[PDB]
Design an enzyme around this catalytic site. Sequence first.
Site, short mmCIF file in Angstrom:
data_model
loop_
_atom_site.label_atom_id
_atom_site.label_comp_id
_atom_site.label_asym_id
_atom_site.label_seq_id
_atom_site.Cartn_x
_atom_site.Cartn_y
_atom_site.Cartn_z
N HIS A 144 0.81 -1.23 0.00
CA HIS A 144 0.00 0.00 0.00
C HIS A 144 0.85 1.28 0.00
CE1 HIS A 144 0.14 -0.35 4.47
NE2 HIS A 144 0.41 0.95 4.32
N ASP A 189 -0.59 -7.64 1.40
CA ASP A 189 0.03 -6.34 1.63
C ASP A 189 1.50 -6.52 1.96
OD1 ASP A 189 0.14 -3.54 1.68
OD2 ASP A 189 -0.70 -3.39 3.72
N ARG A 235 -13.44 -8.50 16.29
CA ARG A 235 -13.19 -7.06 16.41
C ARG A 235 -13.36 -6.32 15.10
NH1 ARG A 235 -14.58 -8.36 20.63
NH2 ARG A 235 -13.18 -9.47 22.06
N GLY A 264 1.91 6.38 9.48
CA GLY A 264 3.34 6.50 9.22
C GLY A 264 4.16 5.31 9.67
N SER A 314 3.16 2.04 8.93
CA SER A 314 2.93 0.99 7.94
C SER A 314 4.18 0.63 7.14
CB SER A 314 1.71 1.29 7.09
OG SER A 314 1.92 2.40 6.24
N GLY A 315 4.32 -0.65 6.79
CA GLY A 315 5.49 -1.14 6.08
C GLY A 315 6.55 -1.64 7.04
N1 LIG Z 1 -3.61 0.98 14.16
C1 LIG Z 1 -3.21 0.35 12.95
C2 LIG Z 1 -2.44 1.31 12.06
C3 LIG Z 1 -1.73 0.48 10.98
C4 LIG Z 1 -0.82 1.36 10.12
C5 LIG Z 1 -1.61 2.51 9.49
C6 LIG Z 1 -0.72 3.39 8.63
O1 LIG Z 1 0.34 3.79 9.05
N2 LIG Z 1 -1.22 3.67 7.38
C7 LIG Z 1 -0.53 4.46 6.37
C8 LIG Z 1 -0.95 3.94 4.99
C9 LIG Z 1 -0.20 4.65 3.90
C10 LIG Z 1 -0.87 5.52 3.04
C11 LIG Z 1 -0.12 6.21 2.08
C12 LIG Z 1 1.26 6.04 1.98
C13 LIG Z 1 1.92 5.17 2.84
C14 LIG Z 1 1.19 4.49 3.81
C15 LIG Z 1 -0.75 5.96 6.50
C16 LIG Z 1 0.36 6.81 6.51
C17 LIG Z 1 0.12 8.19 6.64
C18 LIG Z 1 1.21 9.15 6.64
C19 LIG Z 1 2.45 8.83 6.02
C20 LIG Z 1 3.51 9.76 5.97
C21 LIG Z 1 3.30 11.05 6.53
C22 LIG Z 1 4.04 12.25 6.62
N3 LIG Z 1 5.31 12.36 6.15
N4 LIG Z 1 3.37 13.21 7.28
N5 LIG Z 1 2.18 12.65 7.55
C23 LIG Z 1 2.07 11.35 7.11
C24 LIG Z 1 1.01 10.42 7.20
C25 LIG Z 1 -1.21 8.65 6.68
C26 LIG Z 1 -2.25 7.74 6.65
N6 LIG Z 1 -2.05 6.40 6.55
C27 LIG Z 1 -2.46 3.29 10.51
C28 LIG Z 1 -3.31 2.39 11.42
#
Ligand SMILES: NC[C@H]1CC[C@H](C(=O)N[C@@H](Cc2ccccc2)c2cc(-c3ccc4c(N)[nH]nc4c3)ccn2)CC1
Length: 238
Positions: A44, A93, A161, A186, A188-189
């Site tokens: 993702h 994923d 859940r 942030g 994730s991965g």
């Molecule tokens: N409780 C469980 C938990 C599991 C992990 C999950 C997660 O981390 N999802 C990612 C999915 C994603 C989407 C797009 C690109 C990479 C990954 C994500 C990341 C960010 C993000 C990244 C960098 C940022 C930056 N440089 N400033 N702000 C930023 C915010 C925002 C929203 N979702 C959240 C919930």
Amino acid sequence: IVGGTASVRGEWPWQVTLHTTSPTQRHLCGGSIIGNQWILTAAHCFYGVESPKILRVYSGILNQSEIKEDTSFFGVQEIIIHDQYKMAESGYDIALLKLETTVGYGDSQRPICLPSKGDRNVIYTDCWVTGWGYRKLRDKIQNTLQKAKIPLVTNEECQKRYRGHKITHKMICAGYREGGKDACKGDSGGPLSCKHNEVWHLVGITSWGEGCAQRERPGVYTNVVEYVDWILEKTQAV
Ligand SMILES: NC[C@H]1CC[C@H](C(=O)N[C@@H](Cc2ccccc2)c2cc(-c3ccc4c(N)[nH]nc4c3)ccn2)CC1
């Protein structure tokens, strides 16, 4: 990471920060070193990503502030996304980044072991989720790498859940019933690391969840054991 603490330098040497260059340079995702030219991350992470030319992998970092224009990094040769991947919530994923150069192993950067086939039956009691992600629903990427000890949850418990979702044996969940400690935006991965018989294993990849650290909503991770054959297929090609 919600409800964690600053990590010590060299605590998670497999942990990397995956930065993007387009439009501006910023942390995108976490990842784990699994080989000298290999990073295991989430698929993702690459939703935007049109080419690996815009990626930069930083290893041996505690603080995001250590990264400047003169900071060395690893370029990405190839992005390998699982071919059955549609979305985090459906599974598969998992992604590999083939590095343009070789990671020189040392006390600040080294690989984490993948889980073993026999180790699908083992019970992991010492699991930690790491990252530079948010500490609350709305904040910013953290400077210091955060850590949090999280208990592993059964598929049956995770499925209760997540009504309306299908929690497959290709996913693993981790969380407290009361919440308070979890991965967040942030993270994730990045890795779900578990210590077993004095050795750390990459049990999961931080994938998705309903919010961050909410009561009765555990974090959902790619179950690494279920992808060992796919990782070897991709990393050990002739
Ligand atoms: N409780 C469980 C938990 C599991 C992990 C999950 C997660 O981390 N999802 C990612 C999915 C994603 C989407 C797009 C690109 C990479 C990954 C994500 C990341 C960010 C993000 C990244 C960098 C940022 C930056 N440089 N400033 N702000 C930023 C915010 C925002 C929203 N979702 C959240 C919930």
